[PDB]
C-alpha cells in the first residue's frame, strides 16, 4: 500500500513559483487521497475559487490528474515536511542482504537510498549531514553508500527508527534513518 | 518567470565545475545532461544544470555524491529544474532543486 | 608569483592530465597534453592562493581525470605563475576550473 505521511506533515501554504521550500516535498494525488484527514483539512482551510499545484496533478472540491510537472506553473504548491519525529524508541533495527537503488537527494537536505533484495524494496534508509541527531554520520556513510552503489554488493542496513522521512513519493517502503552499513557474508559476528 | 519544470529521463553526460562569479563563498558544480528518446534538434539533448556548494565547511554535498555516482553509472534520473539561472559556457544553465533516480515507467514516464 | 595579468579566464580545450607534481606543504601541479604536445600547466593549493578554497572540489575531479584519460578542458586563471617544473617550456599557471568535454554536445 501507498505510505501516507501523517496530518502534521504539511506547511500552511507552500512557496510560489513551484519550488517548495528546503526540507519539503511536493504532494502527489495518490498521497492526498491516501488519508481523508488531509482531504477534509485542505477542504476547510482553503476557501474560494482556488486551485493549487501538485506534482502528479492539482487540487480544487474534486481532484484532477495531469502530467508530472505540468501543474507546477501555478504559484501555490503543497509542501509536506519531509521529517516527522515519531517518538518511537531509540533501538537498532537491522535488515540484511539488501543492495542500493533509487537514490534521492535535495537542496540542503538528506541523501536517500532504497534498499532492495530479491526485487522488492525492504527499508528506505537515509542520512542527512545537516539535519537530524545523526548529522555526524553522513561524512562516514557517504563513502559506504558510494562503494555499495558502484559495486552493488549485498549489504545489511541498520537503521534507528526515531525519525521518519518522506522524501520518496508513492513509496510503498517506509523511509527511515540509517546508522550502520555492513558488508557481510551470512554467519558472522560482525553481521 | 520560469516556473519550475520537472525534467524526466535525463542521463548526466558531462560533469563540469567552476568558481562562482557572485561570491568567493560558493562553488558551482554543474553538468550537461541529455534525455533519451528525443531528437537532437531540441536543446533537450544538451540541457545544462548547475548547483552551488558551500566551500566554508569542508566535505562533500550529498547531492554532489549522487551526481558522481549517477554520472559514473550512466543512469536515468528526474530533476526539478528551476527557477534560478547561472552562467555556464556563455549560456544559461538552470538550477536543480532535487533529483530522483527513476524506478520504471510509472515513476519516469 | 603575481604576474599582474588582468585576472581573466583562459580556455584550454581537449586536454588530458599527465605528470602530477606535489610537495609536502605546497601545491600540486599537473601538465595537460593534446595530440602529444603540452598546452598548459595548472596547479591548485589549499595553503596559499586566491583559489585556496577551490582545492577539494578540484582534487575530486583531477584524480578522476588522471585515473581515466577522459576528455577535459582547463579554465586557467593567469594571475599567479609557478616555476615548480624544472625547465618548463610550457607556462605554468593557476587552476580555476576543470570541465569534462562532450564532443556530442559540442560544448567543448
Amino acid at each position, epitope marked *: 500500500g501507498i505510505v501516507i505521511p501523517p496530518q502534521e506533515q504539511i506547511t500552511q501554504h507552500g512557496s510560489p513559483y513551484g519550488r517548495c*521550500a528546503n526540507k519539503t516535498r511536493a504532494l502527489t494525488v495518490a498521497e492526498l487521497r491516501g488519508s481523508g484527514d488531509l482531504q477534509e483539512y485542505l477542504r476547510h482551510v482553503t476557501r474560494g475559487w482556488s486551485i493549487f499545484a501538485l506534482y502528479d496533478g492539482t487540487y480544487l472540491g474534486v481532484i484532477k490528474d495531469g502530467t508530472p510537472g505540468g501543474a507546477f506553473d501555478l504559484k501555490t504548491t503543497f509542501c509536506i515536511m519531509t521529517t516527522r519525529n515519531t517518538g518511537q524508541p531509540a533501538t537498532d533495527h537491522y535488515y540484511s542482504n539488501v543492495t542500493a537503488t533509487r537514490l534521492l537527494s535535495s537542496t540542503n537536505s538528506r541523501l536517500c537510498a532504497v534498499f532492495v533484495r530479491s526485487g522488492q524494496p525492504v527499508i528506505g534508509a537515509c542520512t542527512s549531514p545537516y539535519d537530524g541527531k545523526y548529522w555526524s554520520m553522513y561524512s562516514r556513510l557517504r563513502k559506504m553508500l558510494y562503494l555499495i552503489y558502484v559495486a552493488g554488493i549485498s549489504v545489511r542496513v541498520h537503521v534507528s527508527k526515531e525519525e521518519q522521512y518522506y522524501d520518496y513519493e508513492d513509496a510503498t517502503f517506509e523511509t527511515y534513518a540509517l546508522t550502520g552499513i555492513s558488508i557481510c557474508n551470512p554467519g558472522s559476528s560482525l553481521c | 518567470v520560469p516556473y519550475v519544470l520537472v525534467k524526466t529521463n535525463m542521463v548526466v553526460t558531462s560533469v563540469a565545475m567552476k568558481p562562482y562569479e557572485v*561570491t568567493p563563498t560558493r562553488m558551482l558544480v554543474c553538468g550537461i545532461a541529455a534525455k533519451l528518446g528525443a531528437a537532437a534538434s531540441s536543446p533537450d539533448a544538451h540541457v545544462p544544470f548547475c548547483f*552551488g556548494k558551500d566551500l566554508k565547511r569542508p566535505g562533500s554535498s550529498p547531492m554532489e555524491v549522487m551526481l558522481r555516482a549517477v554520472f559514473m553509472q550512466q543512469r536515468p534520473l528526474r530533476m526539478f529544474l528551476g527557477p534560478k539561472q547561472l552562467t555556464f559556457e556563455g549560456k544559461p544553465a538552470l538550477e536543480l532543486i532535487r533529483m530522483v533516480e527513476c524506478s520504471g515507467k510509472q515513476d519516469c514516464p | 608569483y603575481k604576474t599582474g595579468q588582468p585576472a581573466a579566464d583562459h580556455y584550454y580545450s581537449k586536454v588530458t592530465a599527465t605528470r602530477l607534481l606535489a610537495s609536502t606543504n605546497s601545491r600540486l601541479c599537473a601538465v595537460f597534453v593534446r595530440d602529444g604536445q603540452s598546452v598548459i600547466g595548472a596547479c591548485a593549493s589549499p595553503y596559499e592562493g586566491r583559489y585556496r578554497d577551490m582545492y577539494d572540489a578540484l582534487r575530486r575531479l583531477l584524480y578522476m581525470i588522471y585515473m581515466s584519460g577522459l576528455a577535459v578542458r582547463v579554465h586557467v586563471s593567469k594571475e599567479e605563475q609557478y616555476y615548480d617544473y624544472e625547465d618548463a617550456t610550457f607556462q605554468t599557471y593557476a587552476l580555476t576550473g576543470i570541465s569534462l568535454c562532450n564532443p556530442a554536445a559540442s560544448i567543448c
Partner: antibody
Amino acid sequence: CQVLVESGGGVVRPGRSLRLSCAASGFTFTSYTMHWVRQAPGKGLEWVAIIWYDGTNEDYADSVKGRFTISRDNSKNTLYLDMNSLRAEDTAMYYCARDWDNYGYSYYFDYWGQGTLVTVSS
Amino acid sequence: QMTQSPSTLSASIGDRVTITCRASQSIYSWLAWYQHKPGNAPKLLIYKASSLESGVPSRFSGSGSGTEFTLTISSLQPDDFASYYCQQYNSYPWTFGQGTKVEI
C-alpha cells in the same frame, strides 16, 4: 517594488531583552538571505547577523555571539532580532538588509530599511 | 580594515568627484559601493567594483585595481549629496567603510 520597514526600537536599560521587527511586502520575505546591520553614531557600519532562505545557517559577528539571537518567519513575513544582555556599546541605529544575488550567500545588500534607534544607557 | 579618502569634499553641479578606498589585504573585485542618505535607507550603487544595479544613473563608475579601488561620479546632480561606503565581501568580517560626504 521592494520595501523593508523596521519597528521596535527604544531606550533599554543594560541587561534587558528587546525585539526588533522587519516587515517586507511585494516579494517572498525569506526566499532571500537577510542580514541585520547596525550603525553607531558617528562611526563605521558593521555587520551582525545572517539568515538563509530557510533558516539553516545563522552566523553572528564576533561582538554579538552569545547575546544576539536571530529569527525568521515566513507565515507573517517577519524578520526578528532578539537582544539579551544588551551592553552600552550597542547604542545604535539598527536595520535589516536583503541580499541581491537571491537564493542565499551574498554579503552585499540591495534593499535596506529606514532604521530604528535602540539606545542603551542608565 | 578598509579605509576611504578623502573624509569630506565639495563640488558644484556638473563637476566630477573621485573617492578612493584601500585595504590591508587584497580584495580582488569583491567591492560594494553604497550611498548613505543621512536619514534614509542606503541604496546600492556599485557592485563588483565595475557593474551597476538596475535603475541607477550611469554617471557612477568604478575602478578595481586590486588593493586600491576608485569610485568616480562624472556629473553631480544635487541628488548625489550623501555619504559613500566601500565594502568587502571576501573574508571575515564583511568590513564597511567610514563614509565620505558630498555637499556644496
